[PDB]
């Protein structure tokens, strides 16, 4: 079975270097051209580079020429990408791919995430997203938790120790100008419940060993 297995992605400081690997199995690697393609958050696919089966010809997109270096070890059947002088915009999932004739890509590797950022591991602060005390009962009230200023992902959020699963939306994290992540987890409940029932978000950030239970009790506004 034709397989591409990627490794080497991770966190790199701005200006640094990183080497990506794509191990190929199940076909004759030396008979096929290969490419790197990348994908920025929420964006489309962008082609980076290609190399012929022998390694004699290399091709690069304009945005990356001179800065990254694609190479291959046909004896270990592993493609590679040495990345130098890194910038924040190079943060992406990188895919290796087979040129299977007429420019079609088959197979794709699973991709590997490169995050180019200057930051340390930080556990998050958790803040209530609270409605006000003046909610008509019978209506729908929203409450939640703002999970602010952490790196890296993930944070997991459950509600009432897993008992509250209906109407929960944990939003994808957004990267702030500071380089730290932020996300919100929210739940909607009947407004009549706000005086008798407690709502607690369970936040787990495993890289920083942060465990926080935060209650989104409201405020009199």
């Amino acid at each position: 079975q034709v397989q591409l297995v990627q490794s080497g992605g991770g966190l790199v400081q701005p200006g640094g270097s990183l080497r990506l690997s794509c191990a190929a199995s199940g076909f004759t690697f030396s008979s096929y051209a290969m490419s790197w393609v990348r994908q920025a958050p929420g964006k489309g696919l962008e082609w980076v580079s290609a190399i012929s089966g022998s390694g004699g010809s290399t091709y690069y997109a304009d945005s990356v020429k001179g800065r990254f270096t694609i190479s291959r070890d046909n004896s270990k059947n592993t493609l590679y990408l040495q990345m130098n002088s890194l910038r924040a915009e190079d943060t992406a999932v990188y895919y290796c791919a087979r040129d299977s004739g007429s420019g079609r890509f088959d197979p794709w590797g699973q991709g590997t995430l490169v995050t180019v950022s200057s930051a340390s591991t930080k556990g998050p602060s958790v803040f209530p997203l609270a409605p006000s005390s003046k909610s008509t009962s019978g209506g729908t009230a929203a409450l939640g938790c703002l999970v602010k200023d952490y790196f890296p992902e993930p944070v997991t959020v459950s509600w009432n120790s897993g008992a509250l699963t209906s109407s929960v939306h944990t939003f994808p994290a957004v990267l702030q100008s500071s380089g730290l992540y932020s996300l919100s987890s929210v739940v909607t409940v009947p407004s009549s419940s706000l005086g008798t029932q407690t709502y607690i978000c369970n936040v787990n950030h495993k890289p920083s060993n942060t465990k926080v239970d935060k209650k989104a009790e409201p405020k009199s506004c």
């Binding site: 393609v37 696919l45 299977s100 420019g103 794709w108 803040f127 006000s132 729908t140 939003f171």
Partner: protein
């Protein structure tokens, strides 16, 4: 550089519907255009090569056509697993270029968002930053416009949005918008409002709070 324009940017269709996606090249690319399927969090999968040749293992409901500068992808009868983002790619000359992507949606009836606003906690207010959050709950289609106003002055450049993937039960979206301020600026204004425009709303919905009463 060969510019690829894919249209439309998004399509909402029901299971069983026919969907058509176009890819236009700025220059002649003969027939060297491929179509790809990418499901969320997964690698792209080859669907179509040489504009019209079906890749092995790809269902027969997929078809490609076109030449030169004008190309078309057709799914004759949409099936649940074909929800994905679809990309065209040219292989005529370097650089290789991709279209902007087309996200294919699952159709349901129009649903207006429930809108909620959350002031920052006093805890946050001790750290020197203020986050005001506008939540859009359970709406369809995805297109909605969120504008923040602080004492009726339009804010720009200080909010961020996040949209959920489509719900597997009711096919709606949710949006979180976080407006970020300094503590001093938050204490210097009174009325904070998030204004929502959406296809399902006959008029803009505004949710607001007064900081001095909180």
């Amino acid at each position: 550089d060969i510019q690829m324009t894919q249209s439309p940017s998004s399509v909402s269709a029901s299971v069983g519907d026919r969907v058509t996606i176009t890819c236009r090249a700025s220059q002649g690319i003969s027939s060297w255009l491929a179509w790809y399927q990418q499901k969320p969090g997964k690698a792209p999968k080859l669907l179509i090569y040489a504009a019209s040749s079906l890749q092995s293992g790809v269902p027969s409901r997929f078809s490609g056509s076109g030449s030169g500068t004008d190309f078309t992808l057709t799914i004759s009868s949409l099936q649940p697993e074909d929800f994905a983002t679809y990309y065209c790619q040219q292989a005529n000359s370097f650089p290789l270029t991709f279209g902007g992507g087309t996200k294919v949606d699952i159709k349901r009836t129009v649903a207006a968002p429930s809108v909620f606003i959350f002031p920052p906690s006093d805890e946050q207010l001790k750290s020197g930053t203020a986050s005001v959050v506008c939540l859009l709950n359970n709406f369809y289609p995805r297109e909605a416009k969120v504008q923040w106003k602080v004492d009726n002055a339009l804010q720009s450049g200080n909010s961020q949005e996040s949209v959920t993937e489509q719900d597997s039960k009711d096919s709606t979206y949710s949006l979180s918008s976080t407006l970020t301020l300094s503590k001093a600026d938050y204490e210097k204004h009174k009325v904070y409002a998030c204004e929502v425009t959406h296809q399902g709303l006959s008029s803009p919905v505004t949710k607001s709070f007064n900081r001095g009463e909180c």
